[PDB]
Symmetry: none
Subunit: 332 residues, 4 copies
């Protein structure tokens, strides 16, 4: 078999040796001689080569070459030549760097179906990422119409779209960006649990709809019954939220873990979130990544068994545990 | 003077007492009696009311009312009624929650001019947040045309836009979303340090251009000499990066914390790096662009401290991980020690 | 204005009269009549009372009541009633009596701690112990600096670490454990080993650096040089075998710095012996040094009592009953700060 | 017949001569030539060497060598070669250098600890800190006695406990936490509140009891009387507000016991004031008392150095640099042990 150097591999002289790779998998090789040999080895795989052929070309001791080849291979700095090959080419570099076959990942995305339940801030941003990453079918669910105030966060919408159906404009704008995918709309506000039967089975549901307060509870109980994976995303004012990502039988579910009354109920009935496009976009982006990773199967979604928050007025990411509980009211 | 309960405040009975507020400002008050007083007081300011007028309707001691009033006012859960007097409505709740007068914040955004240096994935997402938040003038700078591969992250672009100038298409799409603002383009590629004088002065530069490796170093040197604020944003493969936000005389600069000697290794390094293409991913791009844009809005708006002052911040995407690189002022810096 | 008796006040019959207070503030009152007058005055303040209301309650002459009131007030045995704040959450409730006993309003001390940043430079034996005291006392932002992984031998004193944690990064496990203990604060990490002086620019500004990193032997001299130049407060803590050491607490422009009071056939032999040095670590010694270090930090930021280690290197013996202090006052002939 | 230089040995040129050793054993040798000779001699024992083998590599007269050998041996700067015969990988290896420096064979000290049993009577701030030190130094059996559950307020000092632990038995969580740190030892619990002297019979025989339970006030008096009658060694530790306190360490027939050196109107006022007493807790003070308590336990059982609190109650101040010992020497007169 042939191997090839990933284009995502950068090399830098640093400290007593140097760096190989960039991002999460960046390696610090302290020993300069080892680092120089890794360079000599990587050089042989810029164009695809078998191990024996590169061994000849590199002209360093076989034991050293074997060391360097192994190091490059384990970190997916060099990859099976078969994994090399296109509109998705940049995403391919991503899948490659996790040690996946991008063609198999792309095929999984192409054959997947994603429900977007809620086509507001989060729906807009999640739906574009998924569509342009080649998710084969996207179903858009909302009964609301576009308003001028939506435009701060709802990136697919224009001034001219005010008054039109949310699902209609998303579908239009999605197809402008990737005409290879199929998009559906369902004009549907979930008023009671039974309405969830109108939401089709899919690989995963992206749930950002937020009214009423126990919508997420209905969705959860429904999806546990239906063996339907879903992921929740949103915000609480300045905090971006994504997760949990519920996987039937594998992860925990959402549930696992008086004249004062009319005053609290009144105050809470008037609540409107004080939030911010950047907050919205962070939640949606990380939600979309967990969806791609879940369907593509190349890396573990972050929000399995977790509800993750990202703060905007300080530097902070924190997770609330949503691990499985054998005493759970809904699952088990 | 009237005060009013912000609509972004919510309350929950919790533990021994309860929670007041949502998000980063949320307060847990363990004492039941005190929590119950804070909500009763909050309730009196649902309609815009002076302290005395609200107190008239309350049925708790005057001294408890004051304590609670003080608590609410300090956390910006109640605000001057004038602050609540529009496309930017949702943004207004945000500003209010930081104790700011949203009309004054909005006017500062209206009077602002922002340079978008680099109109790729970062520049796409930043420019549209800025435009729809009412930044008054935006200047688009790039010399590249759209390619089909751009579409995974460059959210303003359609299939039909392949081959067109990125600046042209961004402008079209921004004015489609906010016709109340001013957008202009400069077809420029920064080739040398000496090209930077061709970039206009602005409230801030959003720098996401990345070619060659030392462009950021030239931008830093120039902006330090020019008294020009800038923010850098981008990614390193799977790591979303924003910062530093350089502010003349206030923060450190990019350089405050600042191939091969063997020829047969050097040329191998150079070829490898010439073939470099980042292994990244819309979610990574979008996180960096979003936090960048938040820092621009806060820097201009003045209502909250931008996160990337004195910091280059990385957000990992395959782990729960955020780390900061120190970019505080060095009194020995070879660029900003004026 | 109400006054209230501190709960930390202790009274006992002793000698010819009695003792008032416990700890550093304990006072032997030989005169029985004045001792009895002190307790009669104190008795009026168990529940909060004004000077005048209490004056009428006491069976003692105005003259004697005045003397006894001032006695109690000046020793902070009675404190302003507002300092009691009985209805605080409270995570930190236990610490309040300590602040009260020094005449401070605990809620104001608590606020200073919440608004502080502390860098822990070195996340070993000393770092474990200091960081946890600081986190649970409510220092608002803690920055963990180290590049080392946990080893089984670390477990004798690196209290936050479990057998299960061997192999993991020290900063990551400390962060995890600190947030399990106090979810209300912020913790961050920097994967960094100071290899030369210039790596110190990678350590951010904070209210104070807690320095227990010890490799190489002159790391402390680099740190000192940097902090003087950077106007950065720091406290050093560690041990010399069986003696626990904390201090100096360097304060820019207030204290001396670390350097202020500073053949042929031998040199190679001296170098060799010293290059082999390993401290005789012993948890009790480590823990004492870390504890008193942490006290000086809390007091430095809290401002309610003088840190012990201002202008001083303090050693506590473990095989003798002994504490000795080494002067580290300013020198005009100092090569670093003179 | 081999000797080896201690790894804990350091030297420095100082004054007219130099320093040898670090910690309590540091010696200043004013004579340059003598100091130089000690270095040359110490150098000869870096590798494990007999007196004769080392002397053959020394470039100094045998009389000078003999005297330097004697100085090094007396101070345990050089130790028997076999005392260094364990793995650097032994979990207790750091403690081993500590034992070496006191002239003990670390394997034998460790054997004594492995076979010891220690009762922890009181699982609050002191018991938390003592128990982990003892667990991770290799005390073979630890018995935890308390009847309280974990509260939010505990977390300031109670280092083994976390927010999630609230509501759980103190002893259950300590056990879990101790075994996570050292799975090579045995840890038991007894749910017991000592309500009267008669309850002390339910506390197991052990090598020593660590006593930090504090309620009622005469609990120490009960413990002392029982232990004297039951021939049971015990150490007391705690605090009196800002003063850390450890001792006495009672050893049947070898030390004094606790009681050795010991209108109705104001009487009732005294009682109510004292009934109201709550210590001004502060983690640094707690941890100091616990650390030195633990040191005394390890030395009592290890037998390599004298526990400090034999015949003494020792106070360490926190707001001044001060350590003081109250005599608790044996009295023939004593009503309890006399
Ligand atoms: N029960 C529900 N069924 C279907 N869609 C829902 C339900 N509840 C909420 N949604 C939709 O989910 C989306 C939530 O997104 P978002 O709140 O950003 O939009 P919005 O409500 O128009 O904006 P704003 O709250 O600022 O007016 C909305 O489009 C809303 O119509
Ligand atoms: N020196 C420079 N001067 C001006 N613009 C620049 C310079 N270097 C880079 N840019 C621009 O900054 C943007 C970088 O964004 P990005 O890399 O996401 O886009 P891209 O290059 O089209 O995509 P890809 O890197 O996937 O090919 C590009 O539009 C590029 O043209
Ligand atoms: N120059 C340096 N930069 C950063 N961290 C350092 C430096 N020198 C020492 N440290 C860190 O400071 C800590 C010192 O603590 P300590 O010596 O108790 O731990 P240790 O070195 O792991 O243990 P031992 O000395 O018993 O092997 C270590 O965690 C070490 O990694
Ligand atoms: N008579 C007794 N019998 C058994 N255990 C006791 C007795 N008296 C006290 N204790 C225990 O000894 C410990 C004393 O330690 P400490 O006072 O630090 O703990 P705490 O009471 O949890 O802390 P705080 O008093 O600050 O709330 C407590 O855990 C307490 O339950
Ligand atoms: Mg909505
Ligand atoms: Mg590019
Ligand atoms: Mg060390
Ligand atoms: Mg207690
Ligand atoms: Zn469940
Ligand atoms: Zn600079
Ligand atoms: Zn000095
Ligand atoms: Zn006695």
């Amino acid at each position: 078999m042939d191997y090839i150097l990933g284009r995502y591999v950068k090399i830098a002289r640093y400290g007593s040796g140097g760096l190989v790779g960039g991002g999460g998998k960046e390696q610090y090789v302290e020993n300069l001689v080892l680092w120089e040999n890794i360079i000599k080895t990587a050089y042989c795989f810029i164009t695809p080569s078998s191990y024996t052929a590169a061994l000849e070309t590199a002209n360093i001791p076989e034991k050293d070459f074997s060391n360097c080849f192994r190091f490059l291979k384990e970190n997916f700095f060099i990859i099976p030549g078969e994994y090399n090959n296109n509109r998705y080419s940049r995403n391919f570099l991503h899948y490659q760097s996790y040690g996946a076959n991008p063609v198999l990942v792309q095929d999984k995305l192409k054959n997947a179906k994603v429900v977007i339940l809620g086509c507001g801030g989060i729906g807009n941003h999640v739906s574009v990422i998924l569509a342009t990453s080649g998710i084969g079918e996207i179903i858009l669910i909302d009964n609301d119409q576009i308003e001028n105030t939506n435009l701060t966060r709802q990136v697919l919408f224009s001034e001219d779209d005010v008054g039109k159906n949310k699902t209609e404009v998303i579908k239009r704008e999605l197809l402008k960006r990737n005409s290879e995918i199929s998009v559906s709309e369902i004009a549907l506000n979930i008023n009671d649990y039974t309405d969830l039967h109108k939401v089709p089975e899919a690989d995963i549901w992206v749930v950002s709809a937020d009214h009423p307060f126990n919508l997420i509870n209905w969705v959860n109980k429904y999806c546990v019954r239906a063996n339907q994976p879903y992921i929740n995303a949103g915000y609480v004012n300045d905090i971006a939220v994504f997760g949990p990502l519920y996987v039937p039988g594998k992860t925990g579910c959402y549930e696992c873990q008086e004249n004062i009354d009319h005053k609290i109920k009144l105050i809470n009935s008037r609540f409107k979130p004080a939030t911010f496009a950047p907050v919205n976009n962070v939640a949606a982006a990380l939600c979309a990544a967990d969806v791609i990773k879940f369907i593509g199967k190349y890396s573990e979604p972050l929000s399995l068994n977790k509800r993750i928050g990202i703060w905007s007025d300080e530097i902070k990411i924190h997770s609330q545990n949503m691990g499985r509980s054998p005493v759970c009211s809904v699952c088990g």
